[PDB]
Enzyme design. Sequence first.
Site, short mmCIF file in Angstrom:
data_model
loop_
_atom_site.label_atom_id
_atom_site.label_comp_id
_atom_site.label_asym_id
_atom_site.label_seq_id
_atom_site.Cartn_x
_atom_site.Cartn_y
_atom_site.Cartn_z
N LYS A 13 42.32 51.44 40.92
CA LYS A 13 43.59 50.76 40.80
C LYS A 13 43.47 49.83 39.58
O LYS A 13 42.82 48.80 39.67
CB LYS A 13 43.93 50.11 42.15
CG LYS A 13 45.24 49.35 42.23
CD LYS A 13 45.57 48.90 43.67
CE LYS A 13 46.44 47.65 43.72
NZ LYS A 13 45.78 46.56 44.48
N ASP A 49 52.50 42.85 54.21
CA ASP A 49 53.17 43.95 53.53
C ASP A 49 52.96 45.25 54.31
O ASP A 49 52.74 46.31 53.73
CB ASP A 49 52.66 44.07 52.08
CG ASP A 49 53.53 44.88 51.15
OD1 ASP A 49 54.74 45.00 51.44
OD2 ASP A 49 52.99 45.37 50.13
#
Length: 330
Positions: A67, A155
Site C-alpha cells: 500500500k 471504518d
Amino acid sequence: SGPVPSRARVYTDVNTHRPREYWDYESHVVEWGNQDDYQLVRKLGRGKYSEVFEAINITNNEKVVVKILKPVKKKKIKREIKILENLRGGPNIITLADIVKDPVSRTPALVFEHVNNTDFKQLYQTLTDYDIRFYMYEILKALDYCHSMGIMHRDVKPHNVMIDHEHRKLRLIDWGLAEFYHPGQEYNVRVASRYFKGPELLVDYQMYDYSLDMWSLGCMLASMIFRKEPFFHGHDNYDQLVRIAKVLGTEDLYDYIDKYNIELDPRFNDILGRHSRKRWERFVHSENQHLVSPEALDFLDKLLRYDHQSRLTAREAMEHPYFYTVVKDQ
Ligand SMILES: O=S(=O)(c1ccc2ncsc2c1)N1CCC(CCNCc2ccc(-c3ccccc3)c(Cl)c2)CC1
Ligand code: NA
C-alpha cells in the site's frame, strides 16, 4: 448546558493502564525496511489515501501486498503503523509485514501479508445463512480484540473485510482511520463512509467509543441478510440520519438527543419529521428469506440503537443465539 459526557461501558481504561508509548503514536519512531526487497507485480486497486499492489519479496519469493501512501500528515501514518503493530497477531487482524520508503520520492509504503480475496460477485450469490453467521462471528473476534486493545476501527464496512472463502479466512483491513480510545476524549465525527456512520457522528456527538463499530457492523449485517446494499442510503449526512429515523423511528432519536443534551443543527428540525419504528418484516422477501431468522432480527435490533451505550458489545454479540451453531462447530 453543553452535551452530557460519556464513557465506554467496557475496556474503558485499557490505554490508561498501558505505558504511554502504546498509544502516544506522535512519539513513535518508524522501523524502515529495505525497499529493494520488493518488486511490484500488478495494481490491485486505488483508495482515498493509497494505491495497492501485489508484489514479491525477492529475498524469500513470498507474495505480499504493498500500500503506497498518498500524501498524509506524518502523525496519521504513525497512528496507523502503531495500531497495526499493537494488533499484530490478533484474531483476523491484517498482518503488517514491513514498512519501506522510496529514497528518491520519499513516498512511504506499508507491506502486508497476502490474502487471496474472493471476488464479490461470486461470494454474494453463494453465501448461505450459515456462512453469514460464521463470517460475522470472525469479524466480531477482530473487533473484540481491537477494542480490548484500546482501539476503535471507525471504518467497518464490506470494503474493509477481506474473505478468502476457500480457506474460510477473514481479515479486517484498512486501519488508517482507527484511533485509541481514551475516556473523555472528543473525536472527529468526520469519519467512516456515509452509509455506515453511527447516529453519534451524524448529530456531532464527539465523546464516542468502540460502540461506533457495533453500529457499522449492524449496518453490514442488515445489508447482507436483506440483500440491500447499502441498507441506509442517505443522499448526504443530514439525509443519512433521516433514512435511519424512517426505520428506527423518531421517538427513540429524540429520547437519545434529550439524554445526552445534544444540540441538533437547525437544518435537521425541518427534515426529521415524525416516523414510527418499523418492523424488520418489511425488508423480508422471497429472495432474502433464507438469510433472515428471528435470531438474526433480534441480534440486528440490539446493534442498531441510537444510544451507543445500549448497543451490544462485541463480546456480548458473540454470545447471541444467532451464533449458537457456529460456536458449537468451532
Ligand atoms: O485488492 S485490494 O485492494 C487489497 C488486497 C489485499 C490487501 N491486504 C491488505 S490491504 C489489501 C487490499 N482489496 C480491496 C478491498 C476488497 C474488499 C473485499 N470485500 C469482500 C466482502 C467482505 C465482507 C462481506 C460480508 C458482509 C457481511 C457479512 C459477511 C460478509 C462481503 Cl459480502 C464481501 C478486497 C480487495
Ligand atoms: Na469517552
